[PDB]
Write a protein that binds this ligand. Structure first.
Ligand code: NA
Ligand code: NA
Ligand code: NA
Ligand code: NA
Ligand code: NA
Ligand code: NA
Ligand code: NA
Ligand code: NA
Lengths: 223, 223, 223, 226
């Protein structure tokens, strides 16, 4: 379960999205090194240009790559589902704007950890910070609070992200998350704890496609 | 006691307010899911327009809905009072402005958890950020520090909130709180600990009344 | 020792100051309620007008009033010295500006906890934020890191404060502190831990003297 | 005097950096002292080649985590002192938001009674009119958290952290640090459980030093084990 993550694992991400009727797709590829909580991914919009800012898609675009320290190993739900994996669902409410609803399957396809997602965004403002593209290309560090959900044999999580806006304000997104295993194998249901995240977004100056390069470090703490 | 909160519980909130002589009332309705620390409430001003910003009323408008993790269950004062409930009193000092004094009864009325409040505000500046309505419609995340009060058979709490102002500054409100059980049944007096809060305020575009929609997630930590 | 702080204790503060040759004095009076980490003080400049902002004097103007939770009672150095008390010395380095050197005696005189201080400030800029009075009248929350000093039979502490400047920046003050008992009685030398502080400054609209009203809540944590 | 014992008093420090950023070569020398018992350092740095081509704040993290205060209960988790006096190699990659990267390699060890940090730094792909080569970073420093992880294969540690650099327009520019430390000797070392270092720093100027220079005071403590 854990054993599938002891080395460098290749990652594939596919997203099909529709926000206020604007349809788009994203494909990402890279690799994860869970032993040290690290991911590097590169994403392209395969349908032309994204109709929303990249930073709004970061949280939707594999918490099985978090570093769980030794003493918290029995609290790593995400890896304990693998290889059959899990369904991750969220509702994401943007301050003063619309909402994303997402559903994703996270599992191994051969040697690759794959995250396949559907996203639906509704009630955004056409001249808001999202559809108006006024969010800075960067990302803050966040804390994801994880709770067992014994009835679903999985977890829930709750967290706010803070997105910098070009006028120097921050726009919050409140995330409600639930994860459910796909297989019937046993899983590790955790005591409450958090994941601390740090991310850096960057650009490849020679990629003419709409794109995002992402590096991330995630670790678990609080037991 | 705890058993009253194991599912979704309907909530009713009623506030009678007077700030610098301006009288108003608010009614709120929604539901709470203490198992995962969640609340959703919708509030209306039933007297016309509020004389103060909505964000100034959030803290006054049911800490019995906080998620206490399993190991901290013996520290959940709030639920241990139920159904007879508790009196919550606060003094709230606004930076460079007036103060709110509040008193509230929190208890079950039938299957509904009801928070009934009186609020009195004094010495506000007529052209300050409060009576001048210069506070942003949003809310930050906060830490509420909880202490047992053995003499009162209850608790005290202390915390600052930070309210964003439209000129990009923050205005602090310093909260002094005390809670006292209404019944004589035994209660759980806690070791020191905190509640971490996260909130999102929103608007219903079709509600013409002065109103606030609130979603909140609260969890206990620090033992 | 602890027993001296079980109720409300009156406080007296006296400061003699000289900053770049500008001499001034301050007297404060109020009371502290260490059981709940609280204090309220009112300070006046007894020599006319202060030559530096009030916020620069807050840290120098009784950590014996911090709330130590039950499990941390053996780590409360400050109360363990009482009534004979302690000498508190600091060096305070202001970002891009001068420094304060302070020495204070903190001890009971009769039933009153008295803080008597000498402050010497050097190398301030005449048109900096301090001597130019460009610091906002407010205060942030801070973390004071406490370490035993076995050779001195006391403690050291280190912390930065952050002072809001009227142009929207923050100016840091780095504090180096040391406390030494006055008596030869035994004291409690603590394990490393912190004090978390929260403060609110206010003004009495009918006090014509240069003055500061201060409310503060301080608690110990981290064992 | 081995490991921890070498740090019980005040230890003199020497720092030497050879740098090249987008082809601009420079050197820095620092001297001062560290008092690990209370997590404190005071250092003064000069650019010995004229003027620095990048802001001083971009060099602070590269310019001796052996001076951190490890509290008593965390003593078995102090990798850095356990290597001494033979010391360690510290390597980093530092990625600046919207700009280039630094790669650094440093040897940290005792030379006689002095703890010496000798560094090579190479910066690439910076923008000529960015905040770094354009000198638009404020002369100050924030407080940070450095997350430390054992690396059992290398007999050492890794660390990960973001710094946040204030920019003159009131924004912050993040630098993401990837770090690895490897002992130089073959003696045994202390491999830690996960934990963090909390940092606080103050930069200042000596009004009578005409050279390009930085005075730095810092306090670092370890935390996060039961
Ligand atoms: Na988001
Ligand atoms: Na996102
Ligand atoms: Na408030
Ligand atoms: Na409020
Ligand atoms: Na200060
Ligand atoms: Na101060
Ligand atoms: Na840096
Ligand atoms: Na740096």
């Amino acid at each position: 379960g854990e054993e599938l993550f002891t080395g460098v694992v290749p990652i594939l991400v596919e997203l099909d999205g529709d926000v206020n009727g604007h349809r788009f797709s994203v494909r990402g590829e890279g690799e994860g090194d869970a032993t040290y909580g690290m991911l590097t991914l590169r994403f392209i919009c395969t349908t032309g240009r994204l109709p929303v800012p990249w930073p709004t898609l970061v949280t939707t675009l594999v918490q099985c790559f978090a570093r769980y320290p030794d003493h918290m190993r029995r609290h790593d739900f995400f890896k304990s589902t693998m290889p059959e994996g899990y369904v991750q669902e969220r509702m994401i409410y943007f301050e003063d704007d619309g909402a994303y609803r997402t559903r994703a399957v996270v599992r191994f396809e051969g040697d690759t950890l794959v995250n396949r997602i559907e996203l639906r965004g509704t009630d955004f403002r056409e001249d808001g910070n999202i559809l108006g593209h006024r969010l800075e290309y960067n990302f803050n560090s966040h804390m994801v609070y994880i709770m067992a959900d014994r009835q679903r044999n999985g977890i829930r999580a709750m967290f706010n992200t803070r997105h910098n806006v070009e006028d120097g304000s921050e726009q919050v997104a409140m995330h409600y998350q639930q994860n459910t295993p796909i297989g019937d194998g046993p899983v590790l249901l955790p005591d409450d704890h958090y994941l601390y995240t740090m991310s850096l977004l960057s650009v490849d100056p020679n990629e003419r496609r709409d794109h995002m390069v992402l590096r991330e470090f995630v670790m678990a703490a609080g037991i």
